[PDB]
Scaffold this active site. Structure first.
Site, short mmCIF file in Angstrom:
data_model
loop_
_atom_site.label_atom_id
_atom_site.label_comp_id
_atom_site.label_asym_id
_atom_site.label_seq_id
_atom_site.Cartn_x
_atom_site.Cartn_y
_atom_site.Cartn_z
N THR F 1 0.85 -1.23 0.00
CA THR F 1 0.00 0.00 0.00
C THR F 1 0.87 1.25 0.00
O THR F 1 1.85 1.33 0.73
CB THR F 1 -0.96 0.03 1.21
N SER F 2 0.50 2.21 -0.84
CA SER F 2 1.13 3.51 -0.86
C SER F 2 0.00 4.51 -0.84
O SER F 2 -0.87 4.49 -1.71
CB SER F 2 1.99 3.68 -2.11
N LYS F 33 -8.94 2.66 -1.72
CA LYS F 33 -8.42 2.91 -0.38
C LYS F 33 -8.72 4.33 0.09
O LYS F 33 -8.35 4.68 1.22
CB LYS F 33 -6.91 2.66 -0.37
#
Ligand code: MG
Ligand code: MG
Ligand code: MG
Ligand code: MG
Lengths: 204, 125, 233, 212, 195, 196, 222, 226, 196, 195
Positions: F1-2, F33
């Site tokens: 995840t970024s 997200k």
């Protein structure tokens, strides 16, 4: 240590033409020590038959529990419980102990009194229903029974032929299991008669 | 901020009458007529939709209610009391029967459960 | 006993009517870090064999040197080194399979899964697998790691049994391999877009394709996906 | 497993069950738990099957080399001690072995040595080894005498295995009997426990608990 | 506690229970009676974890004595054994289970029959002609399988029991300091003072 | 995840990759997200997907009930509710949430709530496994009071690098722009951001 | 930690007839829930009219078979091309297996052939080399599904003669090669239905005085 | 287990294989893994089979009561919300992994939900031990604007990939189609590509083969009059 | 530790921070992690200080003996000797070494040898705990055939960021320039690089 | 092996050693002699791990018999005990140590004195008037401390030993099946056949 294989034992159930059969061995043990040769694992509540393998204290406890429940069912409903309904009761009862389960392998067998239809079912220890057309197996020699049943079984056997098939399935499975044997019982169940037969087998 | 009514509000009078039950029956008597007829291949239940105003949409007020797929109910008396009994009756059909036996209760047993709820309001605190 | 450090993911392969195809991406991962983007994991041996390697890259580089040394050694006092006494896929494989099993038996494995793809002297297709345990098997399609779970099902739809091999052309086989590489790029978190592909054909020989990319990707549908259930915006 | 051996007037009786199990699963009901080391010496199998089989076959080779070199039958004391000294070298490595080395020589008479994988070597008159040993011991201890006939001693050994085969879940299948004399051992047959149990029940009046 | 044996003959039930109480290194007592009279024609012997054994036995004794006074009636051995089984079966899923194994020897005055019940700490009940707990069965059951008959007299039952105790004294590593023997029949419970 | 959130002249922009993994398998390659807790208060989610969804749903409930009683909540108020849940249940949660929002009074605001349940008000915030690789890049290239186009380019380039190096990150770059003008969703595909 | 062992599944079956022997095995090779190969031969002609299978961990199985085949070759060199009898092969295999007693070949080995009197022979080995001549032996994943069936249908266990009611056993009549093959096929069909690791194909090697013959049959591929 | 969900033009389709296993042994060869939550909300189940049946029936029961209370047909988002909040509370101990699909007055929907309580939105999804085999097929052949016939084909092909390549999956393909403005059509055993071949031999025994010790009639009837 | 080697037009430059830690204590704040194995072959050291010193000393011995017999070794040869030690003793070593050197034939070359003992020839390489934070920065800012001044600025800025974010890195930025002209040492102090 | 006792009186050394050999569940033998004659006036009793005890004893026996033949001379008890100690002290730092405890009772023909040496598996040697190994000392030493005199006769030593064995038989949990008793004096070694 494994609760499901301390006491040992097996149950098998089969369907035939207008009939069902359920059968069990008679051994109760404390691991290697044989304790009893008269520990029957099939019980009945009216015309519905329940076989139970696994930990013997739970076998006894669940029999006493389902007798309790089916007695109250009958008083309130004014009729004997049917196999299909009982199967759901067994499942509900097991799942309500999901995180502290009874270490058992129940098997239901019976004929629906209204439709005349042969019915068998099996469960894992937390109540997942296996509703097989052909056969249900349970206990410490379940693998052996699966092997026997899968080759010996054919559909629509007459009651007296079905007796031979289920008997030979149980016996030869039990003789390949250390923790099963010491005698055996076979119930042949028709719509309004039930015959119970004790089998002669090796006592080791 | 306490419930201090832990005692029965329905009690036996000297003559053996349970006053509040009799008075409840009087409230039922004032209520709109509803009926039921049993045939060989069915049952019918019916009532008048007594509309309190013509501006009201009487379709939104259901006096005849499905309890299970094979059981229905109609009433006479106090509508709000009926509505909450239907909610409890629907739920008890699931909790004390369908979630145990995997099928809907027979008519007599669902009736027994409704009857039990009504009895308890006749004796509880 | 060790643990793998710098790793290569899936190697995928299949047989077709006149030969074999093998492919593998150009990535050397360092755990979740996509550390090295120019790693060739298909290593040709002569003009009839390609060895595809996944798992530990330092052990891959050791195996690469063994194969290079094998070619040198085969040329010694061998007038037929480029003819009847040239290295076969089956020779190269059996050698590697011996080494892998020996190393696991000393509790010091080469931490790899290997597929040897090639064409024999008589034109027969060769495709066989070996891993860090010395386990070997052959099949009309072979794949390592994620490829086993995702590429094999797709490649088996083309060549489902031995009798499907003569019916499968090189265009159909390559298409199936290229599509599988796209699927692995969608779904394997330790894969890359850039890959190498090798075709070993009994007529046209070894064709080695570098710097291929996964293309014709479907992402457009992503714009219409919002939240995780109840969100509309 | 149930294995036994005992000394008497007429030599040694050796009796064993035939069952082998992997967990609850009965792998074999036709296992030979008596190793015929040579024509005069017998060994019993308990603990590890491979370990008993392999090293007692090897023992036969050593006994054969002994009598070629020394021009004389190896003593039971010497044969047993070759085996005990061997297993003692492997102590800690994980051999599993509980055996009776049985023989009848001129100088010793009938002799039984219990040999075991943690190095134990014991001479004795009656030994029982295995998961069903306690059951066999009961029948043996209450009925054993030195002056038993060969017929009665053979029955006692057979009956003692049956006792264990019935109760012990990991013993059964069949009973193998041997009688060791000075001129060599004599095999006294394979007896199915299933058929033997019913035969013994009827003839002896025992096992009244079991319905037949 | 170590050895508890039971044998049901023609007209009585005989319970034999060891006298030793060992606490690790030393034998603290050699005359311990590992039994409680639950009712005039029902006796329960017990063996298991220290403290739990006696606590459980006396708890069962109190409940059966309470039942006797309330109803002015003696419960059948079958009824007593079922009650005991349920308490152990309740115990096994508790915070801290009773580790106690019992034999219940009783004479049913209605049926005119002796009855022996074997119940382990899990609540595993079996009716038997003869029974034991722990390792006691391993040594004795081969002798009982051989010699037992359902029509034995009390004196024959005691002789078969002596043979079982002798085999235990020969082959068990622990010194259990002999056994107290008690007989349960139509006339009630009595102790065999010389054994 | 970024994931990241960046304040700029007109308000704030939230940015995120779209990859969700179970081990090395990408369970979802088109994940969203960036989730909405109020009309102009959104968050970026990292950590346990069950935990961050459960938390965000509870926050959305709290701010809906807040709005019914007291009118529109501040971004600080939303961050506080997130913090209360994350801090008090720190033993049973694995959540790393960035809260971003637009008031007219306060303009664009960004709050980061790491594992412990602490709160940190920042001009911009980065989080998730892939953020490690862009601390250097983001610190060198961030300026205050950037335009919308500059801020989109800053987030696009940053998450492009986070995706390049982190196996746990990938897929599309989603963005959500929060200004007085309203709420704008943006999406950027691999063929666009990979060649940067 | 590095685990040197693995489980490649598979199931094998040896049956000894009167003047023949069969060694059958499924052709499926697996790891965990994946299929590696639908046709990976597991039963091998080793020369001298001996057939062998080492089922379990396929790498140790391949190693053992390779070493035994080599042992047959060196037996011929060392002993003037003498035929290696099935009993002698069995003892040689014990020493191969026991040689690695403290790092075992994780396989259940079965061999089949003819003894020196021309009668059918099957030998069965554990992982560390304990062995026995047997009439009937299944090995591997679905061995517990097959052996009870074989007790019943080969040895006629628990079967008595109608009318006598338990007094007279069903007599142990000799089975032909065609009859044995039917029982092998039905064992594997049944095993395939109820065991996930069994399927794809069935390869049977039949050994007679004339030599070694092969038969192949399809099994369900799910 | 292999289970899939595929969105199409005017609805959603779910599918599943029919193998239930205990370890490596197949308990039921024709298991039904497709469950009705409400008439037009169905889900495909993977994971612990008792847990998937229990959680579906509980939420299905509460959904029905909610439908009666509100006088509205149930929504997929309600089933999803109730499932996830229940599963989250039990912290993954209820091992239910579900693909939830349906049609309601809002439209057609497709979600996945995992045991710990995370939910997911998609046009095509797969779950279970055969999910990687299924997803390979889905990633190869899925497109936007699939017809009903194309979606059923794609879904059943994805299950087949699981049946043939995953040992945890086998036997038959069950399908359920939920189209907007129509009754949901449950297609039990939609494909049957794994019928057992005829055995070589009949194993029917001669009567009297088994040795019997005792026979008796069992009284299943109640206590009789007179 | 933050270390890097970068090829450029005239040759190659090695760069490193100067911090060595035992837990949170800085055991040495003026460490020299750029160590010479030959006149124009140097290395950057990361991992176990005992291991990387032991390895480097052995390599310097091997290249000295190589030079006595066969003349000046290539940078590839030096990298190979490093690899041989790291690969064959992988079970007992924790070493991450970047090898950098200048030939006249090959010009500037950089080889990185991570934990496993693999070799990777690259235009530039970054390593050590602090390198994680500058993968994004270094990928965006590196160009081939930079001048000496540009390459010094690239290393200075890169390690400045690595030092800023990594607690394990710090102190002075040492550099070693390798060209035809010779060997130049450079040093840059905190007051210089922190304000960048 | 369990109990080994030793007592040095005026003119002899008495060793008493248990007869039981237990292998886990069962008592395999009840007549085991846990001793070896090393020389005509030196006896060694032993107890410890199975196999190791006899292997060690017989290895010592062989070495002392070899010394006797080579020199045509009997080593003093002190010399024998020192040799034995060194072998055990060597053993404790080995790959696999001998787990064996010994008592060495000997009559020194030069000094005309009985001598008792106690050596544990570590190689801890002590010369004592009376000694034991394992738990044997815990029960018996209080009686020996009380009653022992250095001028006791052999018959008085045996009576004190009977009291020690009786206390062991009362308070030890294990049945060690009695003891074999042997006396070492100027005339050599002899076994007391009735005890
Ligand atoms: Mg059995
Ligand atoms: Mg038995
Ligand atoms: Mg499959
Ligand atoms: Mg710093």
């Amino acid at each position: 240590s494994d609760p499901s294989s301390i006491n040992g034992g097996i149950v098998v159930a089969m369907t035939g033409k207008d009939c069902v059969a359920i059968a069990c061995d008679l051994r109760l043990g404390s691991q290697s020590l044989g304790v009893s040769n008269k520990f029957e694992k099939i019980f009945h509540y009216g015309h519905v038959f329940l076989g139970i393998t696994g930990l013997a204290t739970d076998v006894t406890t669940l029999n006493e529990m389902f007798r309790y429940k089916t007695n109250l069912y009958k008083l309130k409903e004014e009729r004997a419980i049917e196999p299909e309904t009982f199967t759901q009761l067994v499942s509900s009862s097991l799942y309500e102990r999901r995180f502290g389960p009874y270490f058992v392998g129940p098997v239901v067998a019976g004929i629906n009194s209204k439709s005349g239809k042969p019915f068998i079912a099996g469960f894992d220890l937390i109540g997942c229903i296996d509703e097989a057309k052909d056969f249900i197996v349970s206990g410490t020699a379940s693998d052996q029974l699966f092997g026997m049943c899968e080759s010996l079984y054919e559909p629509n056997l007459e009651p007296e032929d079905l007796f031979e098939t289920i008997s030979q399935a149980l016996l030869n499975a039990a003789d390949r299991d250390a923790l099963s044997g010491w005698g055996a019982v076979v119930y042949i169940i028709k719509k309004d008669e039930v015959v119970k037969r004790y089998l002669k087998m090796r006592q080791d | 901020m306490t419930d201090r009514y832990s005692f029965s509000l329905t009690t036996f009078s000297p003559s053996g009458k349970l006053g509040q039950i009799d008075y409840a029956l009087t409230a039922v008597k004032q209520g709109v007529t509803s009926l039921g007829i049993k045939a060989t291949n069915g049952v019918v239940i019916a009532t008048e939709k007594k509309s309190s105003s013509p501006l009201a949409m009487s379709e939104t007020l259901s006096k005849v209610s499905l309890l299970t797929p094979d059981i229905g109910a109609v009433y006479s008396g106090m509508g709000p009391d009926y509505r909450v009994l239907v909610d409890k009756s629907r739920k008890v059909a699931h909790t004390s029967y369908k979630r145990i036996y995997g099928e809907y209760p027979p008519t007599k047993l669902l009736v027994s459960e409704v009857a039990k709820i009504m009895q308890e309001a006749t004796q509880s605190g | 006993t060790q643990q793998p450090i710098v790793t290569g993911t899936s190697v995928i392969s299949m047989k077709y009517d006149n030969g074999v195809i093998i492919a593998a991406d150009n990535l050397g991962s360092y755990g979740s870090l996509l550390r090295f983007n120019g790693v060739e994991r298909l290593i040709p041996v002569g003009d009839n064999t390609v060895v595809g390697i996944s798992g530990d890259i330092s052990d891959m580089q050791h195996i690469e040197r063994l194969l290079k040394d094998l070619v040198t050694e085969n040329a010694y006092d061998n007038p037929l080194a480029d003819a009847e006494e040239a290295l076969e896929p089956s020779y190269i494989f059996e050698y590697l399979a011996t080494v892998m099993y020996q190393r696991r038996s000393k509790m010091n494995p080469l931490w790899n899964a290997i597929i040897v793809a090639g064409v024999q002297s008589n034109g027969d297709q060769f495709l066989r697998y070996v891993n860090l345990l010395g386990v070997t098997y052959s099949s009309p399609t072979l794949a390592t790691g994620f490829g086993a779970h995702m590429a094999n099902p797709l490649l088996r739809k083309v060549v489902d049994r031995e009798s499907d091999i003569p019916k499968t052309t090189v265009q159909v086989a390559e298409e199936a391999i290229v599509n599988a590489m796209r699927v692995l790029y969608y779904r394997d978190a330790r894969s890359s877009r850039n890959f190498s592909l090798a075709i070993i054909d009994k007529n046209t020989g070894l064709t080695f394709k570098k710097n291929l990319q996964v293309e014709n990707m479907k992402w457009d549908f992503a714009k219409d996906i919002k939240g995780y259930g109840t969100q509309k915006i | 497993t149930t294995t036994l051996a005992f000394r008497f007037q007429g030599g040694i009786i050796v009796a064993v069950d035939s069952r082998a199990t992997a967990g609850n699963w009965v792998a074999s009901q036709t296992v030979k738990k008596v190793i015929e080391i040579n024509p005069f010496l017998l060994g019993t199998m308990a603990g590890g099957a491979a370990d008993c089989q392999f090293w007692e076959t090897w023992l036969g080779s050593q006994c054969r080399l002994h009598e070629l070199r020394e021009k004389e039958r190896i003593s039971v004391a010497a044969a047993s001690k070759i085996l005990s000294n061997l297993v003692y070298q492997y102590k800690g490595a994980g051999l599993s072995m509980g055996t009776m080395i049985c023989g009848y020589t001129r100088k010793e008479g009938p002799t039984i040595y219990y040999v075991d994988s943690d190095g134990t070597r014991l001479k004795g008159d009656i030994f029982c080894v295995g998961s069903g040993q306690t059951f066999a011991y009961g029948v043996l201890d209450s009925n054993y005498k030195w002056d038993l006939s060969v017929e009665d001693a053979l029955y006692l050994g057979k009956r003692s295995i049956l006792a264990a085969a019935h109760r012990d879940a990991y013993s059964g299948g069949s009973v193998n009997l041997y009688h060791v004399t000075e001129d060599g051992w004599i095999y006294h047959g394979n007896h199915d426990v299933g058929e033997l149990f019913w035969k013994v029940k009827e003839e002896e009046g025992s096992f009244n608990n079991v319905i037949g | 506690m170590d050895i508890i044996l039971g044998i049901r003959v023609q007209d009585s039930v005989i319970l034999a229970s060891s006298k030793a109480v060992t606490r690790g290194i030393s034998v603290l007592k050699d005359s311990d009676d590992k039994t409680r009279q639950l009712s005039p024609h029902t006796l329960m012997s017990f063996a298991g974890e220290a403290g739990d054994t006696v606590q459980f036995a006396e708890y069962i004794q109190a409940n059966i004595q309470l039942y006797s006074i309330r109803e002015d009636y003696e419960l059948s051995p079958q009824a007593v054994s079922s009650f005991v089984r349920q308490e152990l079966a309740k115990s096994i899923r508790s915070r801290r289970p009773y580790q106690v194994n019992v034999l219940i020897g009783g004479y049913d005055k209605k049926k005119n029959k002796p009855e022996l019940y074997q119940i382990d700490y899990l609540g595993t009940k079996v009716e038997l002609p003869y029974g034991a707990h722990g390792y006691s069965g391993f040594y004795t059951f081969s002798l009982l399988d051989h010699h037992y008959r359902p029509d034995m007299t009390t004196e024959e039952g005691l002789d078969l029991l002596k043979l079982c105790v002798q085999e235990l004294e020969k082959r068990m590593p622990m010194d259990f300091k002999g056994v107290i023997v008690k007989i349960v029949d139509k006339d009630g419970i009595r102790q065999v003072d010389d054994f | 995840t970024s994931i990241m959130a960046v304040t700029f002249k007109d308000g704030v922009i939230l940015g995120a990759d779209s990859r969700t993994t179970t081990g090395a398998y990408i369970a979802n390659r088109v994940t969203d997200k960036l989730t909405r807790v109020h009309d102009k208060i959104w968050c970026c989610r990292s950590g346990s997907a069950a935990d961050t969804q459960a938390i965000a749903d509870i926050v959305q409930y709290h701010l809906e009930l807040y709005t019914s009683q007291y009118g529109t909540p501040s971004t600080e108020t939303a961050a506080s509710v997130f913090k209360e849940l994350c801090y008090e249940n720190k033993d049973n949660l694995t959540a790393g949430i960035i809260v971003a929002g637009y008031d007219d009074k306060n303009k664009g605001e960004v709050y980061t709530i790491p594992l412990g349940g602490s709160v940190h008000k920042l001009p911009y915030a980065i989080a998730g496994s892939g953020s490690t690789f862009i601390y250097g890049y983001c610190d060198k290239n961030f300026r205050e009071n950037m335009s919308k186009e500059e801020t989109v380019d800053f987030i696009k380039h940053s998450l492009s690098q986070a995706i390049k190096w982190d196996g746990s990150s990938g897929g599309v770059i989603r963005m959500v722009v929060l200004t007085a003008a309203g709420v704008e969703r943006l999406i950027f595909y691999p063929d666009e951001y990979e060649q940067l | 930690q590095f685990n040197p062992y693995g489980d490649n599944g598979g199931t094998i079956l040896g049956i000894a007839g009167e003047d023949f022997a069969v060694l059958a095995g499924d052709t499926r090779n697996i790891t965990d829930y994946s299929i590696n190969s639908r046709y990976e031969p597991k039963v091998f002609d080793c020369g001298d009219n001996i057939v062998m299978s080492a089922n379990g961990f396929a790498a140790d199985g391949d190693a053992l078979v390779k070493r035994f085949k080599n042992s047959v070759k060196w037996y011929h060199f060392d002993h003037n091309d003498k035929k290696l009898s099935i009993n002698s092969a069995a003892r040689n295999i014990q020493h191969l297996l026991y040689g690695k007693r403290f790092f075992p070949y994780y396989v259940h080995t079965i061999i089949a052939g003819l003894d020196e009197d021309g009668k059918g022979a099957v030998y069965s080995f554990d992982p560390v080399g304990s062995y026995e001549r047997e009439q009937c032996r299944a090995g591997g994943a679905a061995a517990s599904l097959i052996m009870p069936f074989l007790d019943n249908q080969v040895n006629f266990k628990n079967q008595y003669e109608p009318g006598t009611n338990g007094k007279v056993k069903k007599p142990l009549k000799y089975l032909s090669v065609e009859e044995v093959i039917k029982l092998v096929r039905d064992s594997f069909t049944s095993a395939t239905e109820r065991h996930i690791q069994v399927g794809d194909g069935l390869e049977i090697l039949i050994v007679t005085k004339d030599g070694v013959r092969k038969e192949f049959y399809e099994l369900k591929r799910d | 287990t292999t289970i899939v969900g595929v969105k199409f033009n005017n609805g959603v389709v779910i599918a599943a294989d029919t193998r239930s296993t205990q370890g490596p042994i197949v308990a039921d060869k024709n298991c039904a893994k497709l469950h009705r939550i409400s008439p037009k909300i169905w889900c495909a189940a993977a994971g612990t089979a008792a847990d998937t049946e229990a959680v579906t029936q509980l939420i299905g029961s509460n959904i029905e009561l909610h439908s009666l209370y509100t006088s509205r047909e149930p929504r997929v988002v309600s089933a999803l919300q109730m499932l996830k909040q229940h599963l989250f509370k039990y912290q993954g101990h209820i091992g239910a992994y579900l693909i939830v699909a349906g049609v309601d007055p809002t439209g057609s929907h497709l979600f996945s939900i995992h045991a710990h309580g995370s939910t997911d939105v998609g046009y095509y999804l797969s779950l279970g031990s055969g999910s990687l085999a299924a997803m390979a097929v889905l990633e190869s052949h899925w497109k936007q604007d699939l017809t009903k016939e194309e979606a059923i084909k794609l879904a059943s092909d994805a299950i087949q990939a699981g049946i043939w390549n995953d040992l945890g999956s086998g036997s038959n393909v069950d399908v359920c189609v939920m189209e907007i403005g129509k009754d949901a059509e449950y297609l039990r055993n939609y494909l049957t590509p794994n019928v057992r071949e005829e055995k070589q031999k009949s194993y029917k025994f001669p009567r009297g083969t088994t040795a019997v010790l005792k026979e008796s009639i069992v009284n299943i009837c109640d206590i009789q009059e007179e």
